[PDB]
Amino acid sequence: PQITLWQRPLVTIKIGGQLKEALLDTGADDTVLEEMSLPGRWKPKMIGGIGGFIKVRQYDQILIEICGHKAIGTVLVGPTPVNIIGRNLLTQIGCTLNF
Amino acid sequence: PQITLWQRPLVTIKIGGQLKEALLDTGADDTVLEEMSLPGRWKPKMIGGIGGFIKVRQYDQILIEICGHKAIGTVLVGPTPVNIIGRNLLTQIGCTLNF
Numbered sequence A, B: 001p002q003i004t005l006w007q008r009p010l011v012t013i014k015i016g017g018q019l020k021e022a023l024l025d026t027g028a029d030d031t032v033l034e035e036m037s038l039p040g041r042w043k044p045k046m047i048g049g050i051g052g053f054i055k056v057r058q059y060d061q062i063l064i065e066i067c068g069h070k071a072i073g074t075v076l077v078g079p080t081p082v083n084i085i086g087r088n089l090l091t092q093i094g095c096t097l098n099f
């Protein structure tokens, strides 16, 4: 679909059989989700944002459905204010910026 | 144009007679630029994201040129490590997310 930006570009995503709201963020290299349980082993990663850096848990090859489009990739879990869908998954669903 | 997200969507902007590189950021409510001098009176503001909050200076009615398109809006100036063009200005140039 086509999403304007007068409001936050929030979409519904499905992960671990649960529905959550997440922000489509072209300014994020990675996808960062709020604290939750995911399968498998995780690796450590440090990511930087506007306020500085935070420590997150990296899970690989995670299945996530964004607005009905299935994607399988890396997801970071940590103290983020909101769920963020980054470029790593936006490219998987063919998302582009237009103007 | 149509911008893909394989790489960070960086563009050239013009503000106060200066050419700067900025990130088209759909995950940003506001536009935040690295420390610089702007005309007029400003108001202090606290903005947050990944990592926490930072104190910035808020300037209103600022003219910015983005890839040729002129836009007017509020611009925040502060210790951000990267220049960010947020939704307040992305809307003015007719920017949308598509997939």
Ligand SMILES: CC(C)[C@H](NC(=O)[C@H](OCc1ccccc1)[C@H](O)[C@@H](O)[C@@H](OCc1ccccc1)C(=O)N[C@H](C(=O)NCc1ccccn1)C(C)C)C(=O)NCc1ccccn1
Pocket: A023, A025, A026, A027, A028, A029, A030, A032, A047, A048, A049, A050, A051, A081, A082, A084, B023, B025, B026, B027, B028, B029, B030, B032, B047, B048, B049, B050, B080, B081, B082, B084
């Ligand atoms: C791991 C990624 C998260 C990271 N990218 C960013 O931090 C982007 O910023 C560019 C950026 C990149 C590096 C350093 C600083 C800035 C984001 O899009 C950012 O803009 C946005 O974050 C998502 C978000 C949305 C809503 C609430 C909280 C958080 C955010 O902080 N939005 C704020 C916002 O809208 N806040 C609203 C709010 C809601 C609730 C509570 C408080 N505030 C704005 C005021 C900035 C990244 O790619 N680092 C690699 C990287 C890239 C380049 C250089 C170095 N590393």
